[PDB]
Recover the amino acids of this structure.
C-alpha cells in the first residue's frame, strides 16, 4: 500500500512523541512558545517534563542510527519479495550483527548510500510495472526472434499482426508471456484464464495468411483452425483497427467479425444491467429473472 | 523515633519508597543489557 520502505523504517523506529534527540527543530519549536496550534503549552508542564526536555534540546544527545538504517534495507528487500516475510526477524538479527562486526566510518556511510537508491533508484520497479517488460516485452522479443519472417502468401499482414500483438502485451500491465517447456504461452491476466498456446497458434496460422475466402463458408475450420487460435484472435480483436487486415482475407472474416461479437456484448451488458434492476422495481421472481433474460441475449 | 518498651530486642524497619527502574533492551540475539536506577542509594 505504501510507496517507500524507509518511511516504514521511520515509522517502526522513531518516537511518535516529539523528542529533541532526533527532531530538534520541532522540540525547540514548542519550548520557546512559538506554535500556531496550542502555543501556551510548555510553561504549564511542571519541573518533571520541562528539564527532561529543555536540557536535552539546547544540547542534543548523540544516538546511533545503526539499528534504524538497516530497517530501511531489510524492509526494502522484503517489499520486493527477496526474503520471505517469515524470515526478516532473522536477517535483521544477522545484518545488525554484520554491520557491528565490521563497522567503520565507511560502512555507516555505505548503508546510507544504499538507503537512497532503494528510494529514488527503485523507480525502475515503478517503471516496469507500467512498461511490463518483466515478462511481456523482452520475453516476447525472443518469440519474434523465433518465428520465420518468410511467409509465402501475405507477406505484409504477417508483420502487422505481430505489430499489433506487441502492442497487446504493452498496453496491458497484467498480461505476460513466458518460457515453460519447449513452447511459449500468453495469459491475459495473472490469476487468469485464457492461456493461449502461442507456439501452436502461429504454427496453425502459418500457411494461412493468404486465402481470399468467400463469405459462404463457416463450418470448415474445425479441421483448419484450432479454438485457441480462435481465442488468440479474440484477444487481438480490441487492439486491431480496420486497417490491419483490410476486408477480404479469411482473417477479415474472423478478426472483423470477432470485434462485432465483442461489439454485441459491450452494449448488451448495459441492457443486462437494466433487466436485472427492474425485476426488483416491479416485483419479479429472482429465479425466473435470469432464465428468460439470457435467452433473449444469446 | 521514640517507642514503647518491649521484651525482645527489636529492629526499626524503614522502607524508603525510592524509585527503582530497570531499563533493559537487547540489540542482538543473546546480548541482553540492563540499566538500573535507584535514586538515593545510586546504582547504574
Amino acid at each position: 500500500q505504501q510507496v517507500d520502505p524507509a518511511m516504514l523504517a521511520a515509522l517502526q523506529s522513531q518516537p511518535s512523541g516529539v523528542t529533541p534527540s532526533d527532531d530538534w527543530a520541532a522540540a525547540m519549536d514548542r519550548i520557546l512558545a512559538l506554535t500556531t496550534r496550542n502555543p501556551e503549552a510548555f510553561r504549564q508542564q511542571p519541573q518533571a517534563n520541562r528539564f527532561s526536555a529543555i536540557l536535552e534540546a539546547v544540547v542534543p544527545s548523540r544516538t546511533n542510527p545503526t539499528h534504524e538504517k538497516v530497517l530501511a534495507i531489510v524492509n526494502a528487500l522484503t517489499e520486493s519479495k527477496a526474503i520471505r516475510k517469515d524470515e526478516a526477524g532473522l536477517i535483521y538479527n544477522a545484518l545488525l550483527e554484520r554491520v557491528a562486526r565490521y563497522n567503520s566510518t565507511n560502512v555507516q556511510a555505505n548503508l546510507d548510500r544504499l538507503t537512497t537508491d532503494v528510494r529514488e533508484a527503485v523507480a525502475q520497479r515503478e517503471r516496469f510495472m507500467h512498461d511490463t517488460n518483466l515478462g511481456s516485452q523482452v520475453a516476447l522479443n525472443a518469440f519474434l526472434s523465433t518465428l520465420p519472417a518468410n511467409v509465402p502468401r501475405g507477406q505484409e499482414d504477417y508483420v502487422s499482426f505481430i505489430s499489433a500483438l506487441r502492442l497487446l502485451v504493452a498496453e496491458v500491465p497484467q498480461s505476460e508471456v513466458y518460457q515453460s517447456g519447449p513452447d511459449y504461452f500468453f495469459q491475459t491476466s495473472r490469476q487468469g484464464l485464457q492461456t493461449v498456446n502461442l507456439t501452436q497458434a502461429f504454427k496453425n496460422l502459418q500457411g494461412m495468411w493468404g486465402v481470399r475466402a468467400p463469405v459462404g463458408d463457416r463450418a470448415t475450420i474445425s479441421s483448419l483452425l484450432t479454438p485457441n487460435t480462435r481465442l488468440l484472435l479474440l484477444l487481438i480483436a480490441p487492439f486491431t483497427n480496420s486497417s490491419t487486415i483490410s476486408r477480404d482475407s479469411y482473417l477479415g472474416h474472423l478478426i472483423t467479425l470477432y470485434r462485432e461479437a465483442i461489439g454485441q456484448t459491450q452494449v448488451d451488458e448495459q441492457t443486462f444491467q437494466e433487466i436485472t434492476s427492474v425485476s426488483r422495481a416491479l416485483g419479479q421472481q429472482d429465479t425466473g429473472s435470469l432464465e428468460a433474460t439470457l435467452n433473449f441475449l444469446l | 523515633f521514640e517507642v514503647d518498651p518491649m521484651d525482645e530486642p527489636t529492629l526499626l524497619y524503614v522502607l524508603f519508597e525510592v524509585f527503582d527502574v530497570v531499563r533493559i533492551h537487547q540489540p542482538h540475539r543473546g546480548v541482553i543489557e540492563a540499566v538500573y536506577l535507584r535514586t538515593p542509594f545510586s546504582a547504574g
The interface with chain A takes residues 27-29 of chain B (CB under 8 Å). The first strand of chain B starts at residue 21 and ends at 25.
